[model samples]
Target: IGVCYGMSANNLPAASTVVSMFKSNGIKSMRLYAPNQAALQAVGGTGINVVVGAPNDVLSNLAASPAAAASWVKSNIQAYPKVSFRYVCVGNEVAGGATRNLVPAMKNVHGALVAAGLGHIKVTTSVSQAILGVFSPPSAGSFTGEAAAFMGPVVQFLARTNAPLMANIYPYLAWAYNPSAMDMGYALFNASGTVVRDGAYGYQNLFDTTVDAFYTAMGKHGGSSVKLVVSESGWPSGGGTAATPANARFYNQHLINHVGRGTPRHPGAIETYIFAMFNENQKDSGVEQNWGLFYPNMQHVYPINF
Candidate 1:
């Protein structure tokens, strides 16, 4: 399990201090919303795996010119030789918009990495739950509507390069929006009995079902062999009925403890990164500001093993 080191809040601690926090807590991996130089420098030589995001606004530019992607890699990535950057995320939920440029941008970035002798670092994009058309039965899951237009090619690209499909999942949002349609216990992994029955298989949690949905979708898109990575997943410690310290701790604890156990559809440990290192007060939504595992002062919102 890993944590996302988001720097959206103005009151976040210094990069050096946050790096210390991660190391002391035994955290081995981190994801950044953007390739912030200070944060990358802090993780230098720390042995913590890093994944950096390339902003969506620049996707068009990178798609237009491989040289731009190469320059970005040189300045933001190559400069920090010791920092272990395992992946470069081309965009955040680009399937929702900028669909045409997502795959090309990723290709350009990957080409740039190859030219720079950094081909070992994989290139992928983070996607939101909106990309799924049907996710309930897991086996019946597939991409549809505008999502399918680009996802087919995107999946083909990832399969060709052996890169994982990075998805940002939030079970909390499911229960919050349609409490009656979703079981609170099931969403939180606290269900006493089976919540979803698919043929001989039964599901008690939303995380696995959500993930398998993508797996099934990928299979239909000719990406059955492509692996998957949960680029973002977390519960808020505040903001609404379902977002509370108790719930957040419960969800996070259970998730971390079970992360290595693997999902029912794919039976093996998969990479997962919890969202937000610190509560981002600058966020426009109340819930968005409360997903962090820590406060701006670096104090735990709730005790977690990381």
Candidate 2:
């Protein structure tokens, strides 16, 4: 399991306090929105694996200058206390989020990583569900017409660096945006739906639909060697009509079960990071603000059965 550290707050806790919370909760991985020096330092000796974010605004400068990237890493990363941070996300959901520097920024950061000794650390951007097509039949999937060219080089970059591609696959949005076309229970795998076969593989869940679409697109582009990772996937416990507590429990637990089942095209297990650990009262913007297993007060929203 993974947690989202939304330090976008007023009364932030000390780095050591945050580390204690992670250890207390048994979480070993973290995805942060910024390269917080304090947070990285706090977890240095804690053995928590971190996937740190590089803001999109700095991509152009970082991409253009390996020297700058090296300096950034040398200062914030290589020197961050005892943190075992190993991944640098070029940009979060850049493609569907309408960021122009998506590709250039990612390429530059990657080049810089290689220039630094830490190129062995994984580097890639997180993509949104908006980049998908034909998710039902998994095998018959492709990228959005506009996204293909951009993602083509993305896949190539991941392959070159042996970096895995990260995607925020939200079935909640699928149901919210297209209620009539989507089956909520089926999407969450709480109820079995019609099995959609793609060549030899048969999918009975939305996770498969989303993942298959990803792999198919990657495979078609000769990027079969590149791996796919779910950077974010979960349902909100309470956010109007579409997302609810019961559904959230099913969605999160079922997704974990499916991911544990491994990838269909290959025998290896899939790597994934669930959306979040707690709901933030301060994050009053997206549905994700409420999509947490625990409330801001640390009350359990639902039983995490597994």
Best by TM-score: 1
Please report, in order, the local distance difference test score of every candidate based on alpha carbons: 0.90, 0.75
**Residue 118's lDDT in candidate 2:** 70
Per-residue lDDT over 1-306 for candidate 1, one digit per residue giving the tens place of the 0 to 100 score: 789998777899999999999999988899998889899898999999999999988899899898898898899899999999999999998745587998889999999899889999999999998789998899999887788889999999999999999999989987788889877988898988665787767777999898998899999989999999999889999987788999999999999987798888788998999997899988878789999999998899999986
Candidate 2 residues 152-262, lDDT tens each? 878887887788889888877887777788676667786555676778877676777788788888887778988887888888877556578888887888776677676
Q: How displaced is residue 177 in candidate 1, in Å?
A: 1.3
Q: Assess the local accuracy of residue 161 in candidate 2 as a C-alpha lDDT between 0 and 100.
A: 72
Error (Å) of candidate 1 at residue 5 is: 0.9
Model 1 Cα shift for residue 77 (angstroms):
1.1
TM-score of 1: 0.98
Name the regions of candidate 1 deviating beyond 4 angstroms: 95-97
Give Cα distance to truth, residue 148, candidate 2, Å: 1.1
Model 1 lDDT-worst window of ten: 193-202
